[PDB]
Design a protein around this ligand. Structure first.
Ligand code: NAD
Ligand code: NAD
Lengths: 395, 401
């Protein structure tokens, strides 16, 4: 084997107008730790300033100087799609691949077979479903992610989109923008959240933060999860437990999807399960696009079974220009941005460095960061995932 | 002058462009039993509508027609409200009762009030009476009433939604998705987490306190000011930081929310001079009244980067002219004035409007919490929350739309 590694890092493009020389504000708020006690990332040092854009090609997650100083090769590219890409060419001899879920470099079974030297697939972000976990397990490849880095960010985004759907924000803003007023056109589809029932599939780090933020809105809170929360937490929040997600759906005005993507959860929202939803239900999905059958959502919107769908995640990513969720009525869509706010980037850039430092010094990666290690699901992977391949259709 | 039958003049907004809906997205509304703090829900003798129907538009008539005509009253409903010859101003000369909503307000200026020979009651179906010249009402012995707390919770939700939308850069990001882009860096170059930020509210009244309660779990620092300080127990539970004046509060805040009524004390309180007090890249959410903010001062602060965003549903005048600068500015989260008129809110203020009318026509006193002006002075909620004066100056620009 060898002591020097090729690190291949896939990042999204700089803004169309160029890498920013200024930002809207002087500083970021200080965050001391995560809810529940997990500490913030602890790299030995960082080479960036918090609040800077780190996730684009010019930002490089602040890793270049550290990696090159240790004699490694560091390759950064945004060109990820196809057999022809810079990514797939560099992939053959890469020891480490880094990408973000917002601009994911899909490690399919085929691509992993081509990556002869691959020892570590690192997600700068949360969720590894763009990596085929079964292949990684079989190859002894480590899969790691920076757990909890943007969980709270996404929770804010969920509550924002819930309110946006129920109150009919996006169509109302269009009227204001176009020179209209059109009150009746706006509120013909507009309700208060107060008194509604909201269910969450998975109360994990995001799901629980969502339930906490919804509590003062005086809604009824329902959830299901692979792992039940402690009674103290359920009593505090007035949570109503359900054994299965299908038992939960008919109770809910709003359903929010907070669960990772793996064979148990893939296309869990489909023509059949949508029949369990109340007429005029809302779905917010900030977890993974492929949790929902794309055309089933569209059909449910057109038939009135759903009063709205919003989320920032699509499949595949980037979404094709003709992807149907872009144009459907009653949509609150954004590109996949919620986990990559400037506040979040500072955290996953630091965590990325921490994981790499541990990896190259032969120290153990934090168990909470692990998805796959030593030929098995480990750490957060053992807790939140199941073995299998979720990358089908990413081409 | 005195008789048992009244002419009620009711100004409502137009039906949807495609026509009045006979069906809705959902089967019924959530049950709401009372308001936080104990004020009971409206108590009309009966209601002639189903909760969830569109009541605030001209075909909806606030569900009042059958009740009014059965008692021999004349009920005129119109959306034509702006200008000297509008249906509204012609019918106004002999009206005993005027009803309008803040979303499509029939401005009762001194001039209009002077022309209204029979006007005994100015009824706001909704909250905030600043579209009525209160000094003229006071002088004429006209009663001014509104349906207090009817949509306060609806607006607080709208506020949190817009704070999150501004801070996280929702509107521009959605634009990229709709136009076929992806463009992550363009979205998030302006995108921050709310967590850890400082949020101040001007006024913790029914809306302000509901906003503070909804913001608490987002782990922000909460600041506020008001004419009346909250009880120590409430400050303690929410970790609120009190300021005596709104100008002492601004320099601390990443985000400022305006929850205060419009009257001479608050008019244009956000202007070039007070904006110098804000942190760079501050956000303002204003769901209270458009005229709280000098409109061009807001535009200048957005263009200079003093503000990183401005959002709200309220404009001055209303409807906003097509060339109103807040329509085209960057970093805005604007909607037309809809937050207090969701289908859930309409059910409550329609019932409240009916309750006030029934009281008025039976000679029973209107609930104190509903009163703004009664018997020649600020009374009830009016005494608590308003100051005397005339806020309707410049409202004639609405006729432009
Ligand atoms: N929109 C974004 O930018 C963004 C950022 C983070 C996560 N996401 C996604 O959201 C997911 C959740 O994030 P998280 O931080 O809360 O992770 P988490 O591991 O803390 O929470 C996941 C929860 O899902 C539960 N789970 C797994 N399989 C389940 C099943 N079959 N049925 C019910 N529950 C199941 C787990 O028990 C766990 O509680 C992530 O895996 C990631 O894919 C999106
Ligand atoms: N966008 C909408 O649809 C909508 C619906 C309701 C009201 N608004 C507006 O919001 C305002 C507030 O509504 P509310 O239900 O909270 O009413 P509220 O009367 O309960 O609260 C008003 C608060 O403002 C305070 N106040 C009055 N003058 C003040 C001053 N000079 N400085 C500081 N505080 C002052 C009062 O003490 C009171 O606490 C209304 O007057 C109305 O104009 C908007």
């Amino acid at each position: 084997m060898g002591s020097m590694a090729k690190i291949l890092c896939v990042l999204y493009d700089d803004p169309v107008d160029g890498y920013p020389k200024t930002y809207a504000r002087d500083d970021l708020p200080k965050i001391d730790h995560y809810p529940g006690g997990q500490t913030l990332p602890t790299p030995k040092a960082i080479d960036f300033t918090p609040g800077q854009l780190l996730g684009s090609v010019s930002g490089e997650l602040g890793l270049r100087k550290y990696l090159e100083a240790n004699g490694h090769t560091f390759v950064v590219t945004s060109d990820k799609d196809g057999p022809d890409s810079v990514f797939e060419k560099e992939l053959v001899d890469a020891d480490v691949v880094i990408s973000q879920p917002f601009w994911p470099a899909y490690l399919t079974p085929e691509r992993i077979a081509k990556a002869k030297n691959l020892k570590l697939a690192l997600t700068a972000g949360i969720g590894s479903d763009h990596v085929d976990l079964q292949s990684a397990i079989d190859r002894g490849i480590t899969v790691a992610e920076v757990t909890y880095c943007n969980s709270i960010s996404v929770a804010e985004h969920v509550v924002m989109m819930i309110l946006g759907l129920v109150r009919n924000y996006i169509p109302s803003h269009d009227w204001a923008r176009k020179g209209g007023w059109n009150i009746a056109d706006c509120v013909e589809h507009s309700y208060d959240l107060e008194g509604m029932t909201v269910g969450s599939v998975a109360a994990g780090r995001i799901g629980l933060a969502v339930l906490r933020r919804l509590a003062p809105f005086d809604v009824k809170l329902h959830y299901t999860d692979r792992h039940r929360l402690p009674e103290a937490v359920e009593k505090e929040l007035g949570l109503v437990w359900h054994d299965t997600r299908e038992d939960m759906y008919p109770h809910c005005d709003v359903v929010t999807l907070n669960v990772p993507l793996h064979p148990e959860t893939e296309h869990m929202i489909n023509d059949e399960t949508l029949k369990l939803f109340k007429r005029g239900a809302y779905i917010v999905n900030t977890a993974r696009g492929k949790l929902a059958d794309r055309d089933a959502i569209v059909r449910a919107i057109e038939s009135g079974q759903l009063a709205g769908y919003a989320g920032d995640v699509w499949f595949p990513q980037p979404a094709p220009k003709d992807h149907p969720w872009r144009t459907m009525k009653w949509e609150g869509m954004t590109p996949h941005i919620s986990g990559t706010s400037l506040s979040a980037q500072a955290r996953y850039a630091a965590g990325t460095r921490e994981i790499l430092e541990c990896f190259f010094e032969g120290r153990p990666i934090r168990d909470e960061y692990l998805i796959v290690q030593g030929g098995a699901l480990a750490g957060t992977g053992a807790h939140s995932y199941s073995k299998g391949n979720a990358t089908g259709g990413s081409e």
